[PDB]
Design a binder for this molecule. Structure first.
Ligand SMILES: CCCS(=O)(=O)Nc1ccc(F)c(NC(=O)Nc2cc(NCCO)ncn2)c1F
Ligand SMILES: CCCS(=O)(=O)Nc1ccc(F)c(NC(=O)Nc2cc(NCCO)ncn2)c1F
Lengths: 260, 262
């Protein structure tokens, strides 16, 4: 019935994940899985409560483009379990191993990313932290959006969010901006502001609105509709940003227009 | 929250086939989906409840090797919504389009099929109707076992003796599933359906019933691993208490899988 994996069917193996928000591993549980150790041992009822409530959200999701939640566990220590992805992150591909994708594939990856997000917003879930780092290309064709449940990745933050004008800057639109940047990534092979060695400047500039991503780097064969759709997603006034309903349409229209 | 998908949201496309109390259509709903249209038009509370229950069973499963449940609808008529698959059924591949899968793939398809079953069993769910038509082969490498909702409540080749002879009220067990598995194991190692050399269905049913007939294993292609052929037989045991369980089945596959690729 309940999604709490009982004690010790999970074989934490191979380390993977970075900082402290959580630490990620490869595991075994009816086949390969990934496990995110929340590493906040001895909760603390109720942070156990807030957490289990966080779970409530993940279990709200059943969809191909969203990293599949398989379960959570408390007992060894708080943790989350998802399907393992045989492949590499949109980030990794693009910016570390430098994968030359077909333009077609690029458009497709965007489309699937688009698909997923739209589904999330359908179930009223703001991701709050999309980035090329969280888009895993499973088996090199299926796009899996993860790390939405529950610092140094500010290139995807809409100014509205950078500059902290109130308590809640995070909208669907904040999410559309992020997506707009991963569009940019796909379309230019690279990061924004790739030519600025200082972070706080980037924060300050995009915040105050002096520094905008260079769109002249969208190489030649990125179709105008897609480039214009990038333009759209990045508009700094969020109201002028199109949501995924419409975002999906614009792509799927130029999707027909070019499998030849 | 509720996995009920309001009427008018699901675009219904191509009719693709029949399957256990409904018709199946390719469909749009947040991108491609499959839709089984439960043609038992307007229940009948509480068969409306029966639906709700079997759905309860479904949402208990979240696995890679299990066809992704996505939603249901009572509203226009009754329906189950799951992920679409670019690919064909394992039955289709094998006995209709005649794909020639290399051994390694075949062991892999097998392993994954097991994978899912173990999961389903891990959650006390008997499939009751595993066949090569149920196992879908998505983007031609990921197995997705579908079709076990309702099935409480067409094809006897996968049916274990203990089932075929009605005998008692419930013959369906894990081991029953294991048998079925055994058959698609045969299917994969031969690309035949069993008893291809008998034209009479009753006859087949009868004899398997008393175990006069049983799959002709000697037909496994020249290079199907020793361990595999051995395992097939363990899964095809006539005495239901001699078949192994999916934990142990995975056990022996993964072994022979590592004893292989190089
Ligand atoms: C629906 C996810 C729930 S969430 O809290 O939003 N995210 C979340 C929770 C637990 C996890 F282990 C992960 N996974 C990761 O952080 N990474 C990951 C990498 C990978 N392949 C690595 C080889 O390229 N396969 C699976 N997961 C999550 F994304
Ligand atoms: C997942 C458990 C729910 S169930 O009721 O047990 N089965 C069940 C429920 C609704 C469906 F649409 C289906 N699907 C099917 O029967 N077939 C199917 C074929 C396909 N393409 C291959 C055509 O090329 N892609 C997706 N699904 C089910 F299997």
């Amino acid at each position: 019935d309940d999604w709490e994996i009982p004690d010790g069917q999970i074989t934490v193996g191979q380390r993977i994940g970075s900082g402290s928000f959580g630490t990620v591993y490869k595991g075994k549980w009816h086949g390969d899985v990934a496990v995110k150790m929340l590493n906040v041992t001895a909760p603390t009822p109720q942070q156990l409560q807030a957490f289990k409530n966080e779970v409530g959200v993940l279990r709200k999701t059943r969809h191909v483009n969203i990293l599949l939640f398989m379960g959570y566990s408390t007992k060894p220590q708080l943790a989350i379990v998802t399907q393992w992805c045989e492949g590499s992150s949109l980030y990794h591909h693009l910016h570390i191993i430098e994968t030359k994708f077909e333009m077609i594939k690029l458009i497709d990856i965007a489309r699937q990313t688009a698909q997923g997000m739209d589904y999330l917003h359908a179930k009223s879930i703001i991701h709050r932290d999309l980035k090329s780092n969280n888009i895993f290309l499973h088996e090199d064709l299926t796009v899996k959006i993860g790390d939405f449940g529950l610092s140094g990745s500010i290139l995807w933050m809409a100014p509205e969010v950078i500059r902290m004008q109130d308590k809640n800057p995070y909208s669907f639109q904040s999410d559309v901006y992020a997506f707009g940047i991963v569009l940019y990534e796909l379309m230019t092979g690279q990061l924004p502001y790739s030519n600025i060695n200082n972070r706080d400047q980037i924060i300050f500039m995009v915040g105050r609105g002096y520094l905008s991503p260079d769109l002249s780097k969208v190489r030649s064969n990125c179709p105008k509709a897609m480039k214009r759709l990038m333009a759209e997603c990045l508009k700094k006034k969020r109201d002028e940003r199109p949501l995924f309903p419409q975002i999906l349409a614009s792509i799927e229209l130029l999707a027909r227009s070019l499998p030849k």
